[PDB]
Amino acid sequence: ATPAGPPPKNFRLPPPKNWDEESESTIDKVGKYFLMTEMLRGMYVLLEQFFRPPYTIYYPFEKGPISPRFRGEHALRRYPSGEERCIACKLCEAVCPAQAITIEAEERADGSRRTTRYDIDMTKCIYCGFCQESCPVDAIVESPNAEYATETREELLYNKEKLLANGDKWEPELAAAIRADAPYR
Amino acid sequence: AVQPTKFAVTVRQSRNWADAKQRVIAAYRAWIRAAPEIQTMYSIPFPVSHIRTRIRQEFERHRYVNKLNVVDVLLQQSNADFQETMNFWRQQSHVMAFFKELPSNFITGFLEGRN
Amino acid sequence: PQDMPPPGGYEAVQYKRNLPSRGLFRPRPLLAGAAVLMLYGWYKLVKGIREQNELAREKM
Amino acid sequence: LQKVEVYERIKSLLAGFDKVNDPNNITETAHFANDLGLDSLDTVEVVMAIEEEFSIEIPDKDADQIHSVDKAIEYILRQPDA
Amino acid sequence: VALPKDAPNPRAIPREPVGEIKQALVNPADKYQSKADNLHKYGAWLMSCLPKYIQQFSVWKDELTIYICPTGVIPVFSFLKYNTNAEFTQVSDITAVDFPTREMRFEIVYNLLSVRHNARIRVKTYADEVTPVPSITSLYMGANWYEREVYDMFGVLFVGHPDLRRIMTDYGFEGHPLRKDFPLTGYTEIRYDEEKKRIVVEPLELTQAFRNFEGGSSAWDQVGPGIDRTPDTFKLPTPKPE
Amino acid sequence: KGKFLVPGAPTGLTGLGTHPSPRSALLYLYHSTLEKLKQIPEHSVYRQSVEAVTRHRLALVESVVPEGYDAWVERAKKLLEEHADQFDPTKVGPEGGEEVQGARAVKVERDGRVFVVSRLPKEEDERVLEWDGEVDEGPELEGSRTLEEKIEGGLEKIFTRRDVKDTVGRVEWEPEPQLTAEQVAELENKIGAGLIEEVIQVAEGELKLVDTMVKARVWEPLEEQPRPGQWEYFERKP
Amino acid sequence: SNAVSITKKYTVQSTGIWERIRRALVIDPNRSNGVPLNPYNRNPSPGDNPPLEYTDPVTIPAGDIADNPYWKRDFRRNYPRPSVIAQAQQVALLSVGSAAQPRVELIGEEGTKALVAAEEEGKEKGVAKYLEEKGAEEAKRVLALTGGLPPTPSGQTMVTGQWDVHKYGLAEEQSYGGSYPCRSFV
Ligand SMILES: *P(=O)(O)OCC(C)(C)[C@H](O)C(=O)NCCC(=O)NCCSC(=O)CCCCCCCCCCCCC
Ligand code: SF4
Ligand code: SF4
Secondary structure, eight states: OSSSSSSOOOOSOOOOOOTTTTOOOHHHHHHHHHTTTTHHHHHHHHHHHTSSSOOOOTTTTSOOOOTOOOOOOOOOOOOSSSBBBOOOOOOOHHSSOOOEEEEEEEEOSSEEEEEEEEEEETTOOOOOHHEEEEESSSEEEEEEEOOOOOOSGGGGEEEEHHHHHHHHHHHHHHHHHHHHHHGGG | OOOOTTTOOOOOOOOSSSHHHHHHHHHHHHHHHHHHHHHHTTTSSHHHHHHHHHHHHHHHHTOOOOHHHHHHHHHHHHHHHHHEEEETTTOHHHHHHHHOOOOOHHEEETTSSOO | OOOOOTOOOOOOOOOOOOOOOGGGOOOHHHHHHHHHHHHHHHHHHHHHHHHHHHHHHHHH | OTTTTTHHHHHHHHSSSSSSSOGGOTTTTBTTTTOOOOOOHHHHHHHHHHHOOOOOOOOHHHHHHHHHHHHHHHHHHHHHHH | OOOTTTTTOSSHHHHHHHHOOOOOOOOTTTSSSSTHHHHHHHHHHHHHOOOTTEEEEEEEESEEEEEEEEGGGGHHHEEEHHSTOOOEEEEEEEEEEETTSSSSEEEEEEEEEEEETTTEEEEEEOEEEEEEEEOOOOOOTTTTHHHHHHHTOOOEEEEEEOOOOOOSSSSOOSSOTHHHHHTTSSSEEEEEEEETTEEEEEEEEEEEEOOOOOGGSOOOOSSSBOOOOOOGGOOOOBBBBO | OOOOOTTTTTTTTTBBBBSHHHHHHHHHHHHHHHHHGGGOOOHHHHHHHHHHHHHHHHHHHHSSSSHHHHHHHHHHHHHHHTTTTTTTTTOOOOSSSSOOOSSSSEEEEBBTTTEEOOOOOOOOOOOGOOGGGGGOOOOOSSSSHHHHHHHTTGGGGGGGGOTTTTOOOOOOOHHHHHHHHOHHHHHHHHOSSSSHHHHHHHHHHHHHHHHHHHHHHHTTTSSSHHHHHHHSSOOOOO | OOOOOOOSSSSSSOHHHHHHHHHHHSSSSSSSSOOOOOTTTTTTGGSSTTTTTOOOOOOOOHHOOOOGGGGGGGGTTOOBEEEEEEGGGHHHHHHHHHHHSOOEEEEETTTTHHHHHHHHHHHSSSSHHHHHHOOOOHHHHHHHTTSSSOOOOSOOOOTTSSSOOOOOBBSSOTTTTTTOOOOOOO
């Protein structure tokens, strides 16, 4: 048990106190017993909570606070010209810890290295952000969006058509989050 | 320490082949004695004859073992499978997963795809 | 710059146990005030029952 | 119980068992292995069947001793249940 | 907002600037040499008190490992529980590691603590799919569930163990999933069946097969051999010239 | 009042109480251990280690003598030598006697040192103590009984057991002077293994370890050489 | 009491009569209500913190452009190897000593042939056999390797400059006083 070496000073407890050694008055001890004193204090503490402002917010009219680093649903992003930023390096497919990303690429009609397939199984994803961490060109990002609950699981299998549409819709926040969070990356 | 459960048996090695011989009979007896009790615990709709048939076949697959240290692993597994069954830790789906209610020729296998 | 503490450091916080005994919950005043309520209540009760027994005499 | 009563039911059970070589070989002094052609597991089933019919429990020590019909009869008389 | 009278805005306080940052380089292994000699003597001392069972010992940084043969599990752990200089009264942990290249596949690794001496020690023994290991449940009540995990995950019997049964896997489960030859996703999977109105078991099919990216491992060795850090007191002497 | 530790008072470690007699107990435990090692060959490092540690700690416990020990030990010799029959384990049993509701004591030898272990009857309140604390063996056998049943009853105990109040041929053993709570700390500052109650439990586990080492024969040559490749890992050639 | 004032506690305050009322009717008027300050808490939001302000930090040696080859900081590839001692060369270390404490001189040639024998005798006969024939005084020299007593196992603190047992002591201030069964240690 205790450390080797000299035993801790005063580690041995003092000898037990007898009933007639407890220095509490009978009037106090009996009063506390019969008057339920300590539990009246607890009742009172609830009373002053009753007259304190509540903590509650009125979701969805009010929303709790989220940061620029918040990790929500995925979106594929474009350059200011409308060209896709994704170049099919496959780094995010490799680093994924849950194997939720499946990518197929080719040379495009104009000789460009672009994806032909881009799927995220949103029921396999763990929402860690490792895929946006690894992107060389800021293509895959996680939006600040958390409200995208669906009726079926097929609605959670995102193809490139769904992910580009997400970036096309959410670009103003995705840009404002990257702006606010880039220097720390 | 914590109490071993109702059918918990201490893990001990077989002394000789006579020891193993007597333990295997004890385990087979204890299983087929319990088949009526398994049927009403797990609401088996088959009769107890089928349940005891399956117990016999499980023992028969280890029939031709001539190694004490393989038998004792096997006597361990049956002890845990017996204890697990009698205390009703497993459920009906597990007990029915145990009852199954490959192509028989090359040509049959070939024509359907491999099997 | 990175997120640093202020020059002299932050001022101390309150962490030591703080449950100070309040006179509202002491077993002497509560027992005493209970005895005053309980003795006054029996005083009014003696007046009440004495009057009701007299009210009963008139009704009979 | 009665000796003839505790033997007649055994013959019906033993003949009722599916794969004995022949129902004639069952006698009062017949052996399961040498005569009735029952291996280890078949013999354990036979003592199990005998115990269920007589509504008695046969312990591990004396269950092994029953390798012949006569031994089953003597144990049934020895144990006081029916 | 009713602000408190003595709580200023803390962001509104100016931070003094910090410029050039100096940072010394440190080998984190250098702090462990001041007890290298001591960890080798303790490991050597055990080797001498119990030479029937202790095969070798190794010292890495602050961890001392003791290698023993399986027939000595009880006496060695009895010595480490009850000796005055070996008051190792907890088993922190008991796990196994599978080495299929070794005949004895399984390495049984126990971890002990000595709060009296603020000391830790590792003991390693070996078993295979048929060799059992002596249980230590008679010396360490807390070892009951660890040995059950080794038996469940790897399939190692622990002779003397009371109530040795599965602790991690599903009830009817067959196989030892921490074995290297056990496939990652197993052999079976379950579903609720509409025709049978129950959970049923089926051979494992996968809508998307697991993609093993292990073939992307480096063609070049990235760590090298390391360094030797054995103290002079546990090296043999060198014949001086002439 | 505060001169002596109170036996069974909690020590601050749960389930660990104050030892009624810590000094003698360590000597008993140490001498008992120094006796069991003698069935180990002298070339065993295990023997030399335990033999070294125990003697080092033994001389420290001897160094702390309770007050008046010399006077009591001179008295207590004149009791054991005059009335050796009373305290003889071969005569009164290893438990000191059969009457637990009175005082009991035997004389024990370790290494040649002489120990007297006493069992004062358990201190319980008067109002929940039946027959002075006598042992209840149940009702005497009455009615028609066979001789064997009367034998199994305990019929030979009429002629050997004692009325506790019958004390003429016996002497009341006064036990050893104890260590004043200052000395207990002073002794445990020397030993340096925590409280003396902790030191005692480590000593008694040390006593039981010797029997396991002796049986296993831990000092004999290695049983199983590790086979080739057994302790190989993933090391890179130096 | 060990209470700090409510006026330093960064929560929304009562004011005026309701401050007077609340200090009259609470158990501790220095306890806070737990409601943070809108001007101070998380203001500005991290999403409007200027990016130019934060600077990613580089240390002088590691990040310098002219005073660090990588190989003098490549501490990962300078990793320690495990140091493994077997019975075959524990008998050896007992036979002839060690580069620190040699037993005999081993001068020049004719000492090497003794050096291999110390290793060879370890591989032919182990530690138990070695102590058998040298007798009990070799076993006594084993304890001499640690000064006569068996070695103590090494502690894991080094907060005092040497690897030791941490010395737990009773804290100067006991938060539950003595009233409650929880004691405070340092
Ligand atoms: P006779 O001399 O012929 O003796 C027959 C035996 C079987 C003893 C053999 O001669 C023999 O010695 N062979 C080797 C031992 C052997 O057959 N196997 C080892 C025994 S363990 C074993 O076989 C376990 C089988 C599986 C578990 C028990 C069966 C019940 C499973 C579950 C039933 C239903 C649950 C829902
Ligand atoms: S890491 Fe980014 S750029 Fe590269 S393939 Fe994946 S999404 Fe495209
Ligand atoms: S955030 Fe999702 S998609 Fe990206 S790496 Fe993690 S699990 Fe995969």
